[PDB]
Symmetry: C3
Subunit: 213 residues, 3 copies
Amino acid sequence: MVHQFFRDMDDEESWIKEKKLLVSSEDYGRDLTGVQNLRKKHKRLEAELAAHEPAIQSVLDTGKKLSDDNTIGKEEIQQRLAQFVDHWKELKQLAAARGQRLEESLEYQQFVANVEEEEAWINEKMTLVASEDYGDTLAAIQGLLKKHEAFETDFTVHKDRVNDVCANGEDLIKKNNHHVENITAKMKGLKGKVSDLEKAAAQRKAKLDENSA
Amino acid sequence: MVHQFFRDMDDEESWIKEKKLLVSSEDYGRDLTGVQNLRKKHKRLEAELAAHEPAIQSVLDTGKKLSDDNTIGKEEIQQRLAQFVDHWKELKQLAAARGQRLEESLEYQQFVANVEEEEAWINEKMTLVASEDYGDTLAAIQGLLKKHEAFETDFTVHKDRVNDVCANGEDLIKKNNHHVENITAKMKGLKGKVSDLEKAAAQRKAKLDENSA
Amino acid sequence: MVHQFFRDMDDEESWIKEKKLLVSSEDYGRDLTGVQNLRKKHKRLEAELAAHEPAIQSVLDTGKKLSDDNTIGKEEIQQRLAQFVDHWKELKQLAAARGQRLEESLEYQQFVANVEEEEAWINEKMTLVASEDYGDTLAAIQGLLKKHEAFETDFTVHKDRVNDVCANGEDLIKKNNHHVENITAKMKGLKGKVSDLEKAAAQRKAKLDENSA
């Protein structure tokens, strides 16, 4: 009874101590897929905590009955119960904390991934727009002009996506200062690439019209 | 939100494509156990699609929200959302169709298995009834009559079972043209076997009665 | 209807017969950990029985429908069903019985483990109390007194725990009468060890007090 109570409490505390070290990991992942995998793993740990909740509560309930029955050794029991509750609350707090840090990491890696998607698109169009072919016949120029138009339509959509990625970066910086330097530089870099492509596109459009007029 | 939406939709789409491909199997089993095993397996896949509905619905919800906010690039979101919804409907449609076909296969293989159980019993009794030992002593003869009387009751049950098997075959044919030739021939053969056993049993019974009178 | 009914019944009877043979184990564990491991395994089997109920009932329902529709061979169907019901009932009764025996084993091994915990504690304190170093300085002697005082409080708790262990032992003897001789001797031995420690502790305390006066 009191013997089983202490064996159960000791067993749960050993478990808690082991889970505490697992939730003490400061690995937040290197990229989007990496963080997504860690969040799946953290959710499995949270289910494990939930699975032990009943056994934990049984120890507390048994401890309360022992204390209310004025069992001899009552003081040692109460102190052990308070230390037990403390280890459990601490574990839960650490697990919640890591879960939160992983959510922050997820938002950050999404921004890093989004910046790469927009920059890769811009980089490929920069090469396209730098073409030296301005049409060898008037009819050929009409073909290039319509293709340029198709490009601008798509560019307008990407300009709006870039604004959203930047608004997202500004929000990450506001929530706190993690990776502030990298985030600020990537937003400036991305806006700079959009400006460079707008300049390059305008120059090509001007050449094409000059050529056909 | 738009970048993650396209990543999630792409991932769900490739998933859907895999399952679509699996569910396109044209294997319906070679015997009863074979169909039963394919159905267990199909049931797993069905529960799966069901425990994967939230993720698909989550994508549709985001698409709706993104499309409503008339965010630029609205047209792309709608076309992608549309083909997505159709890929999902297609999969659910193909899965349900296979489940139905496996259901048909099951009834058909149960009929085939039932025919074999009845034919095997009949073949074994034909040999017994072909015996020419009518009993030497007065105690042997009645021992033989006793075994025949039990056979008669058993044959009465099997005749009813054969009628049930044939009714089932007629129903299968009624439901569709699958394996009609084989089902038709098996019913005819089974009735013929019953008729032949009735004839052999009668000859055997008469010899036994004539010998003990 | 009928053919699949007998195939399902035969398959369930094979399942039942296998679980029956499994639940026939006479293994109840050699120590506390061992019993706890066997109870976890037993609970998994109890869950399987609950999960299988619908399948058993389904055969029973079909059999009733066949019986009510006066299908031919009604008597064999009724006799096979009554046989099937008895096997399922027998399995459930055997499982319940093993479960109860395992609970009896748990209580007994808890008592054996608790006895060992108290005796190990007494044995280690017996050697400490046997020490003949009563002090060296006016401060070393006070140190020894401080430690003996902490020990007296701990011994007060253990005396109560030994009393609970003996109460548990007499309850085991009253409720099942198994291992009576071993339980009786262990309680006698344990009370004997407390008495011996009380005597040795008082001799030690006397010397410490005398030396400090």
